[model samples]
Target: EPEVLVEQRDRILIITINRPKAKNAVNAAVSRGLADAMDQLDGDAGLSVAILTGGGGSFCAGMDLKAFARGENVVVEGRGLGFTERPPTKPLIAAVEGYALAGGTELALAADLIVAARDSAFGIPEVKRGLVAGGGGLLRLPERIPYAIAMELALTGDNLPAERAHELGLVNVLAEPGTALDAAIALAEKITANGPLAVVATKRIITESRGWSPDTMFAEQMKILVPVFTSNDAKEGAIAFAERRRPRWTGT
Candidate 1:
């Protein structure tokens, strides 16, 4: 069984967790597979973006408790929850469907963008079980929404429906039923059309610049942007724009 399916369409890497029977829970196999996919996304310069989704009618229901109860290690080195610990350098979009809960929601939280169907629901209910969401959810969710709302979700273990999440900007694209992946791919394609170097660096700056002091933010951004400015793709992008043609990015 293909617990994880990865496909490349031009510069987009579409990764699907295929265990619909169990709601695509993250098990040992799924974790390793997803970690490898993230490696492929970052190691390949030709790939500019990624979309993570699930098969069947639902997205992930979180980590596989059956496997966890069996004491199987579900984490990959430097890639907990299959890359939730350390996501790729490139952009990743979560194509969310029904039943995004616990670690499921955490994985979605790791992505740079979220494309959610109207029926999809997101929540971190670990607190109710005397646990905590250590899979970067505690980090990403707050920034994606209002701090008070994020705390409410974590503390109350409440679900955030797609429409409300979209209203609060947590969801980048709100799709109709059964079309989250397509909407996510459309978003990825838009990102892939840009200079690869610029896109990667833009993500880098946004992620890393959060640590920069307010007074030093511009200088910090320039430091991260220097390599992009000096990259060959930068010059190619300028020329392509002047020539009114799509820029061919070498990821240089």
Candidate 2:
């Protein structure tokens, strides 16, 4: 069976982990598929966003231990799990349900936004197995949630419910069980209506500016901001608003 599935839907490419029998766990093929999908996401100038999800009821159960035990390399070098180590420059949304735990949680964290089913739970139980979450969990959890709460979840290996995560602003949308993908696509629709260049630049600044110092922040940001600010799409936006019509973006 294919480890990953790709469905291109208009301006939003939907990628799914396809190992439903193993709860859509990450394996060698999934890693390669995801890395390729990310390349497509960034390479296609017309694609405004992507929705990463999984098949069956589960989003993902982290790395396939069985595959690992067989000595298969499940990581795509710099991409890591679900491109957690090297996410695309464009915006990506996580459409999650079921068990998005351990490395699964790290996958979702790599996405810019998360739209989750109410029944979904996020966790990191690596420590319980005497293993640490080397899949970027500890690095991203605190940034997503509060320090104390994030540390507690990390240390105790507890799962946080979708509703609770939504309350804490970790989840952008709390969907019903079967509606997460549709909801995420709808969310992507709202975003896709904008200029594609502007959208890409927006994510770039927000994600990359984290490393900028106070002195170089503006300077570093300008490298990304100036192009979008001067893009043809930028002017089209103003003119469209004045003319009371939708702007046709060329992504210039």
lDDT of 1 by residue, 1-252 (tens): 689999999889999999998899999999988988999999987788999999986889999989988987796667888888898899999999998998899899889999999999999999999999888888889999999999999999999999999998999999999999999999999999988889888999888887989999999899878999999999999999999998888878
Candidate 1 stretches with Cα past 4 Å from truth are: none
TM-score of candidate 2 against the unseen true structure: 0.97
TM-score of each: 0.96, 0.97
- Among all windows of 10 consecutive residues in model 1, the one with the lowest summed lDDT is 71-80
Error of 1 at 8 (Å): 1.0
